[PDB]
Amino acid sequence: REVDPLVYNMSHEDPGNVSYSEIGGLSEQIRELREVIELPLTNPELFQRVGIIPPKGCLLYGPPGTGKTLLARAVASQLDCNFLKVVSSSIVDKYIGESARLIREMFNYARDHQPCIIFMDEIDAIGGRRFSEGTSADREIQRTLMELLNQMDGFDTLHRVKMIMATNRPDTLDPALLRPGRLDRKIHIDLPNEQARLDILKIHAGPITKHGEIDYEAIVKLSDGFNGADLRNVCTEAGMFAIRADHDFVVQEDFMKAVRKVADSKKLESKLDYKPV
Amino acid sequence: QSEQPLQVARCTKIINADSEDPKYIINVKQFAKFVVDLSDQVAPTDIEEGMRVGVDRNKYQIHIPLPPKIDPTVTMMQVEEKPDVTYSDVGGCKEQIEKLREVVETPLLHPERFVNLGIEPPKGVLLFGPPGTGKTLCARAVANRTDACFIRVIGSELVQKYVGEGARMVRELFEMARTKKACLIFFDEIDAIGGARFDDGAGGDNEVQRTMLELINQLDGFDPRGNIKVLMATNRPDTLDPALMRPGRLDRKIEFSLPD
Amino acid sequence: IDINDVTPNCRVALRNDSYTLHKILPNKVDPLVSLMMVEKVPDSTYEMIGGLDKQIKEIKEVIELPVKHPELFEALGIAQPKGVLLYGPPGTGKTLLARAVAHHTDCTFIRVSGSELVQKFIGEGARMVRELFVMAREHAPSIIFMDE
Amino acid sequence: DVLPPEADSSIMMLTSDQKPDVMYADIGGMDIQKQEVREAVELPLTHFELYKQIGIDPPRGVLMYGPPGCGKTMLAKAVAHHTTAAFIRVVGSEFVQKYLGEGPRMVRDVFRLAKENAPAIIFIDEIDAIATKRFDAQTGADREVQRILLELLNQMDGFDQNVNVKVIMATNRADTLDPALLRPGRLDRKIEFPLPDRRQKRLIFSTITSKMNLSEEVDLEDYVARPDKISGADINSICQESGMLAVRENRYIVLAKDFEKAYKTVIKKDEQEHEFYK
Amino acid sequence: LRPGRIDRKIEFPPPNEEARLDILKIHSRKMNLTRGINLRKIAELMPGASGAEVKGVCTEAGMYALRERRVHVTQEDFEMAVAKVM
Amino acid sequence: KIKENSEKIKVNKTLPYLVSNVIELLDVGKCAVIKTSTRQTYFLPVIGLVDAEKLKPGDLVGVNKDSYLILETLPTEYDSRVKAMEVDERPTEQYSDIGGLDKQIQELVEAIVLPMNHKEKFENLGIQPPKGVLMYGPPGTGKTLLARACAAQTKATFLKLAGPQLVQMFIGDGAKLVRDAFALAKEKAPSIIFIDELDAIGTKRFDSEKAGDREVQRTMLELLNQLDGFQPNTQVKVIAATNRVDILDPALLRSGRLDRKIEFPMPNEEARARIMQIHSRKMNVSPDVNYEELARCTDDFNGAQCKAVCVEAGMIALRRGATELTHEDYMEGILEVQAKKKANLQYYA
Amino acid sequence: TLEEIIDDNHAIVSTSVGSEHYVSILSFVDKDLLEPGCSVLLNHKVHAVIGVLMDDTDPLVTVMKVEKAPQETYADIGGLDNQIQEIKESVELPLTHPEYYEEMGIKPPKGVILYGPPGTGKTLLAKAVANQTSATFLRVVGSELIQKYLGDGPKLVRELFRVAEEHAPSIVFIDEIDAIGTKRYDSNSGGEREIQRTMLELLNQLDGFDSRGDVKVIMA
Ligand SMILES: Nc1ncnc2c1ncn2[C@@H]1O[C@H](COP(=O)(O)OP(=O)(O)OP(=O)(O)O)[C@@H](O)[C@H]1O
Ligand SMILES: Nc1ncnc2c1ncn2[C@@H]1O[C@H](COP(=O)(O)OP(=O)(O)OP(=O)(O)O)[C@@H](O)[C@H]1O
Ligand SMILES: Nc1ncnc2c1ncn2[C@@H]1O[C@H](COP(=O)(O)OP(=O)(O)OP(=O)(O)O)[C@@H](O)[C@H]1O
Ligand SMILES: Nc1ncnc2c1ncn2[C@@H]1O[C@H](COP(=O)(O)OP(=O)(O)OP(=O)(O)O)[C@@H](O)[C@H]1O
Ligand SMILES: Nc1ncnc2c1ncn2[C@@H]1O[C@H](COP(=O)(O)OP(=O)(O)O)[C@@H](O)[C@H]1O
Ligand SMILES: Nc1ncnc2c1ncn2[C@@H]1O[C@H](COP(=O)(O)OP(=O)(O)O)[C@@H](O)[C@H]1O
Ligand SMILES: [Mg+2]
Ligand SMILES: [Mg+2]
Ligand SMILES: [Mg+2]
Ligand SMILES: [Mg+2]
Ligand SMILES: [Mg+2]
């Protein structure tokens, strides 16, 4: 059976070497994702004994920059079973039926290599709501979506093939896609809380050569409403202040300036609390 | 029996562009892509990596460089027959005529008086006023009196059914104007596509705002706009985008107020 | 082949090399026939209809008489009626009676619904709904039926 | 030459292995839908003589419309498992092919295969992938979809009585279907698959939990008797998450604690419903 | 509604009792009706129903005769069909 | 017989080739499953004249027309639209040509240039350089002008995308454009990518039950993933520019995609005077010009408006014909650039 | 199709399959009536431009043109004496006696609006003018101008007025022009603003840059 060059590179993309130690506030979410992915594919008889078929689909949904793609990269790097990387917008092709054919080939490759995971980043590129008055392009993309839905939970059952789908606009997804049978477990990668912000800030300031006493608690207190990428940018801006001052290190004054700068930058955002259903 | 037909392709890449025997990747539209070489009558420098290569059949090599593609809709916009209206048929707007004449004609007639003082003449005008004041009349007078390529465009002619088709033809219009040495473009009824961008919540006017933004970027962006001078005729100069009204794109706003 | 027999919208065989019309094949399915086959309005008759006899009488007048007897109206001195509208809740016999009267009068019953699935049959570049009138005139007498 | 009418791209299911493992016992509830699908697809395939003798005209096409997760494809799987007639499954999205003419060819092939293997049941999942009502000639993809849909209509119209081929179609969004596909005639009947009532929730809970090993303290009645509009897929998700929690705690018996946590984790639709409107 | 276009406006109200009886007779002509069925009684039992509903009643009476494996549609089948449809 | 073998090989390898792909590379001894631009899939029992272990699924190859045997490996495909939007003839605008923007320059220059030239600072401080620089500004100011100055003074691979260039029909296009642009920037040496008029592509997503801007949303999503997604691209820097960030999607403004969200202000009095001088340096300027007076008169002239003041002052001089401005031609230019509609308000006290 | 003309004896012709052959144009063709978008006859083997086409008109042209004289006449109208006089002065008189206008030194009115309550003889005078006039009568409606896809409304307006010029002298009668306004339809993708752009296209066609030929506009 043919393997498309697309599906080949999908399988062979390098997820860096991200470890679970590089993810902060996400501990419950990490273990839910691992529950869905790893354990059913390593000890598939515990769930048989309990009398269930383990969940198949995960929806990592949350505000931008909360760590969905980082978590997906960590899973891809730290698990062994076959893995298929794909951005849902890089499946779309202008030819007739080409996108649906590509999705069919994705699932055919997954079934051929039985223990497999399929990660679709920013699924709302394809899995958007279906229009009752859309254009021809919208109808083609909806054909692609419905091919995907049939592949997940259509007539032919899926065995040992798991789905992960990352999004930050889950409200726009098709209800058939968000259905419990297709995307079984919808986990919310929410904005870091106090302890999550502390953990992320420590993670991203560990390699920075600090030469003072760092009230990470004060930085976290001023980082209310931030995301993980915002905290990484806080570290980067503290470093920027260091270079601009011509210093080969960082201090708490720099960190405070950086966090206030990022807080000011946050004023240009919009609604972020988007939920499914 | 002597001029063989040539299928039009596009030179995608020039493998080994050095003096060594090069190879050109052509893409015969909707037919196929090939690696080919030049005819011995065609100089290497005559062909770039984006020109319409124009290759023959049968070992696709007999080259003829060929100009950029222009949509028939866009190319059927040059004013071939000049309007029968003159500047003497417009009355009561002497100062408006003087300003519009300056901007559109005088640089295109006596450029020496401008390069002597080192001035960049204003390149962009917005004739705005109530319904019926001499806006289209003055546009027709300019078209009649001008010795240059006059391209009329109607705001409603940039509304097209497929996403990116309005901006596509804006790009084609401006690049055709660029190919021509001295061009006046005239967007009449510019209210159609030129409107202030509003977020809304249902994505209304996204396509018209995209084509307007393409026009904005073509008027003043990361590129020398060329020797193109633009007219914007409107009777609702309150919807036009602030970016469109910026004096980097509409330098010489003229008001066709009701005559005294 | 007499060129007078190659009237537009007819299938014809063309020789492989140097295309040359050398036979008039059986005519393609009429676009109206295809459109009505797609719409699939069930055939009806007055005997299938029951319970609306005064309504049968009125529709009979206004549809049958103008096309069969266009002399009663001329003698009366009134323009032939050309528009009928049928009030009534769903499934009370409006389409049934329209189809029955068309069938009995022998008028070609053209069901207009606005579906884009039949727009190629009406006309490929159908930017106007009046383009059905060429078909209606060709298959006249015609009854164009709309349903809300 | 003329080939045997078995040339086709859409092959029947090899009932030896491709047959689904679902059953009318595994479904549970939805007896109205089960009976309607029976009388539409299964009875006329072994009693068409009785139909003709009592004066009924058997239908071809049932359309199984309804919300997502209510049991359309599951009932299709059960019908495929139990039926003793040929079964040709296909997805509406599979009929759209790059090669122009393929897809009308595929529709012809599926219907020819069904006719030559009669009694047969065709099953098109997500019919609204090709049965949409808005078509934009001048786009190519929609022209091909129009050709596919018209070929499908022609095939179903060309099935006179005495032919044992029953069409079944599935769609979450039936409002977007073209009315012609549903047109009174030998084109379609309609069955609804709505969100189950409270007693249907009870039946689905019972059937899904019969396969698990619950502790005697569960009392699924408390969960059944709640004011939530949740599908059979939602009930399966609730039971599945309860089992997942039991596995997490390393137990092989599911507890009321597990079911409580699973229900609160799965049915999280609670939001808004402002109290001043009532 | 301008009084110059719709040359005639006909009204198809919901069928009367007699109209419902006529519709029921027409739509039952096409089934095995056991001798002596009170189609008038069925029409009376189904008031305020359209011809489509009458046809559905006939079809469901046939379906009930099918469910009780039998060759002739009967009064009981018509009664149950009316009850189910309405 | 090396000579004659090479002669036969060259005879078979004469142009023109048909360019195909290497979609699959099977082992049976290695064989190819190439797909050729005539849209034809041919299985090659013998790969051909190119090394088998140099071909990977999807790469572009040259093939004999008739034998369909791979003859060469060709460079990667970049839409002639993504190659035509690369800067070859560099702009010429020193930072001195910029007016009231000094902090904004410093910020951009830092975030873009410094990680390119002085990466050692970042490495020794243990920092990740800032990724994206978004230049908000009112319809005026110096966003595109600063982009031009950066492209002129950077000496790197500059790729000017513009917004409405990436919005196409033929679903998949636009996303392909963005992918090709970022891939070209990646293959080239250190490179900047300038998104002119970002709001054309980055408009916020919405939920709609009847219709929506789904294709542009998909292209924006591809851009989002390219900026900060599964595959880190730390060698291609991105500077976007826009007039309305209230339009842009939140996922496009997040840190990691566009972290230095610079804001270009209305020029102050000194900034306006400096812009006047910058655009009057090349004219025949009179020695009595109170540029501070002109700046005070400007009063919220934002961007070009000052250049337009200078140009229209030159035009006003040109009416008479002279070598002078005498801060009356500039006064008239300010008057005619204010664009105040004519009125007969001379009855005011 | 003829995509573009490069010079005499050369042109780019798009074959039905999409190929874009750059080919010579022989002396046979008039080197006239050739504008981008036109149909062209191409030699099968060499694809040389050897003829032109479009001798047929489009279904839109056929439907718009009134290839008939309505039986109603000015004598069949009673009471609209002044309205008949003015509409005649606008549409018929300049066609039957251009000498009056040419000697007076004025151009006739370009358009006329027939405005009145629901039923007063507006379309009746349109019918009478069509019956008596020697110009080609093109009838359109406002709801008939309201199109479905974005850009179809303006395209239809442009096509209608181009047909009017091609068949000039012509009278373009737009009945119920307020239908482009008052009525709202879901088929219209763009909606109110696409309606506005269609109206703007009508504005340009009625009085815009392009010089009109002999096309008198009646609008009810
Ligand atoms: N929980 C976290 N712990 C550590 N780093 C985080 C976390 N969340 C985000 N980041 C940082 O954010 C950047 C990557 O974010 P990521 O791509 O995972 O976001 P996302 O949630 O998928 O958002 P988007 O909706 O924009 O795609 C990296 O800098 C990563 O370090
Ligand atoms: N100032 C003027 N001098 C002479 N004729 C004029 C003048 N203004 C209008 N006209 C007459 O009116 C017509 C010109 O109007 P024009 O088409 O230019 O209007 P416009 O200002 O562009 O309005 P619209 O908003 O309706 O497009 C011609 O008939 C011309 O004779
Ligand atoms: N009535 C039911 N009884 C038991 N389980 C059910 C029932 N309905 C649905 N399910 C469960 O839901 C899943 C089956 O969903 P199915 O594919 O039948 O949905 P559908 O109604 O066709 O919807 P869609 O088209 O949105 O996928 C399986 O988990 C099945 O266990
Ligand atoms: N601070 C400044 N110093 C010098 N020239 C300036 C300045 N601000 C604007 N300009 C002038 O503005 C014109 C170009 O403006 P530019 O393209 O930079 O605007 P922008 O910020 O991209 O805005 P937009 O595209 O919304 O109109 C040039 O004349 C440039 O000289
Ligand atoms: N007056 C009637 N007599 C007999 N049958 C009727 C009558 N009215 C409706 N029907 C039946 O109802 C069904 C649907 O009627 P239909 O023609 O759709 O009515 P409408 O056009 O008002 O919806 C038809 O199958 C028809 O047999
Ligand atoms: N003198 C008249 N005044 C008004 N209506 C008349 C006159 N003579 C005839 N009619 C009738 O009026 C109808 C035309 O009305 P019309 O002008 O179309 O009204 P509207 O256009 O406002 O709907 C025709 O059916 C015609 O027979
Ligand atoms: Mg992500
Ligand atoms: Mg005008
Ligand atoms: Mg299903
Ligand atoms: Mg700019
Ligand atoms: Mg009228």
Side-chain angles (χ1 to χ4, degrees), chain D residues 78-185:
Chain D
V79 168
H81 169 89
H82 282 274
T83 193
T84 188
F87 204 97
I88 317 188
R89 56 159 191 71
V90 64
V91 187
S93 305
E94 292 188 1
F95 292 118
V96 192
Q97 307 276 321
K98 288 196 287 293
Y99 198 56
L100 295 174
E102 280 185 352
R105 259 197 278 293
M106 293 177 70
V107 174
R108 289 186 211 100
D109 288 354
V110 292
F111 279 106
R112 206 204 306 146
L113 182 65
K115 170 167 275 190
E116 265 74 358
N117 302 139
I121 300 162
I122 307 166
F123 172 61
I124 296 166
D125 214 353
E126 306 305 340
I127 182 62
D128 63 69
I130 59 173
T132 54
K133 61 170 64 171
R134 290 169 62 93
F135 301 93
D136 182 341
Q138 198 196 315
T139 300
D142 278 345
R143 287 201 313 268
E144 191 60 12
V145 176
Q146 198 193 356
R147 270 195 291 275
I148 290 166
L149 178 54
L150 282 180
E151 204 66 6
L152 169 60
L153 296 178
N154 273 263
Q155 294 307 125
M156 293 183 286
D157 288 322
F159 282 165
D160 62 357
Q161 277 90 18
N162 322 314
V163 72
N164 277 349
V165 292
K166 291 280 177 293
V167 189
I168 310 177
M169 293 180 183
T171 188
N172 290 318
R173 282 273 282 286
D175 60 357
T176 59
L177 293 191
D178 187 57
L181 179 71
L182 309 177
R183 179 66 65 192

Side-chain angles (χ1 to χ4, degrees), chain D residues 247-258:
Chain D
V247 173
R248 197 188 217 156
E249 279 165 24
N250 206 359
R251 294 170 289 110
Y252 60 80
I253 309 191
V254 188
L255 299 168
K257 176 179 49 162
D258 306 345

